[PDB]
Design a protein around this ligand. Structure first.
Ligand SMILES: [Ca+2]
Ligand SMILES: [Ca+2]
Ligand SMILES: [Ca+2]
Ligand SMILES: [Ca+2]
Lengths: 20, 148
C-alpha cells in the first residue's frame, strides 16, 4: 500500500528471532 | 551550564556571516561548497553533505550560529536514555548520528534481508518519517514501534 510500515519494523524483528 | 557570551562569539558570527558569502545567516553545502571548491578545492560533492550533516546537531535545515558554535567549541556526544532497542539503534544508525534519513536503511535494510532500491529506501523513509521534517528521528522510531 504505502511500503515501509511494518516492513523495516519487521526487519529488526527478523534479527532478534535469529540474531545470528 | 555556562552561558556563552554573545559579544565575542558574535564576532565569530561576523565571520560565520561572511563565511556564508551571501548574508543569509545559514551555511549550507551551497555556499560552503562554493568556498570548499574554490578554496577548499577538495571536499567531495557528498563530503560537504557529510560535513553539513556532521554539524547538524539540531539538524533543523542547515548550519546556524549556535550549532556551528558548539561543534567548533566542544565535540562531546554523550547519551543517557537508550536502554532498549539500543542494539538495533546502533544497527540502524550506520553513519553515526541517530536519525535514519536513508543511508543506513539502504545498506542495513538491503543486507538485513531484502534489497530496498534507492526508490524504496527514499520513499519508505519519506512515508515512514512520521514527523516528516526531513529525516527520521529516533523519537518517532520508538513512538511508532515501541509506543502504541
Ligand atoms: Ca545561506
Ligand atoms: Ca542544523
Ligand atoms: Ca544515522
Ligand atoms: Ca522525523
Amino acid at each position: 500500500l504505502r511500503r515501509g510500515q511494518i516492513l523495516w519494523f519487521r526487519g529488526l524483528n527478523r534479527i532478534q528471532t535469529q540474531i545470528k | 551550564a555556562d552561558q556563552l557570551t554573545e559579544e565575542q562569539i558574535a564576532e565569530f558570527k561576523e565571520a560565520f556571516s561572511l563565511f556564508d558569502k551571501d548574508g543569509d545567516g545559514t551555511i549550507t553545502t551551497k555556499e560552503l561548497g562554493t568556498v570548499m571548491r574554490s578554496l577548499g578545492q577538495n571536499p567531495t560533492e557528498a563530503e560537504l553533505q557529510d560535513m553539513i550533516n556532521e554539524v547538524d546537531a539540531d539538524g533543523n535545515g542547515t548550519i546556524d550560529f549556535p550549532e556551528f558554535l558548539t561543534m567548533m567549541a566542544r565535540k562531546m556526544k554523550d547519551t543517557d536514555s537508550e536502554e532498549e532497542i539500543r542494539e538495533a539503534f546502533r544497527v540502524f544508525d550506520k553513519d553515526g548520528n541517530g536519525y535514519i534519513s536513508a543511508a543506513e536503511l539502504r545498506h542495513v535494510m538491503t543486507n538485513l534481508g531484502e534489497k530496498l532500491t534507492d526508490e524504496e529506501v527514499d520513499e519508505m523513509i519519506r512515508e515512514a518519517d512520521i514527523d516528516g521534517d526531513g529525516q527520521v528521528n529516533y523519537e518517532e522510531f520508538v513512538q511508532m514501534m515501541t509506543a502504541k
